[PDB]
Amino acid sequence: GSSGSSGAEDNLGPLPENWEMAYTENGEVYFIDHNTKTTSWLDPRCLNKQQSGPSSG
Predict the structure, then answer these.
(1) CB–CB of 34/44 below 8 Å?
(2) Which one of 7, 13, 30, 54 is most buried, by most CB atoms within 10 A?
(3) For the chain, percent helix, then strand, then coil, each to nearest 5?
(4) How many CA atoms lie within 13 A of 1 on its CB side?
(5) What SS3 class is residue 7?
(6) Per-residue b/e over 10-35, b at no fewer than 16 CB within 10 Å?
(7) Which domain holds residue 34?
(8) DSSP symbols for 28-41
(9) How many helices (H) and strands (E) does the chain have?
(10) Organism's domain of life?
(11) How many other C-beta atoms lie within 10 A of the C-beta of residue 41?
(12) 3-state secondary structure of 15
């Protein structure tokens, strides 16, 4: 029953070189992950465990 989302720093740093943040035609901001060639709605820097293996969301 791990407590709610908790465990982030105040200085993550500028996105890596294997990523590209862009907005769709409509205007939806997304993050392009080349390292794995995957697309996400949220930012990786915030996440701890990158998209490893099969991920529903």
Answers:
(1) no
(2) 30
(3) 0, 25, 75
(4) 0
(5) coil
(6) eeeeeeeeeeeeeeeeeeeeebebee
(7) 1-57
(8) -EEEEETTTTEEES
(9) 0, 3
(10) Eukaryota
(11) 9
(12) coil
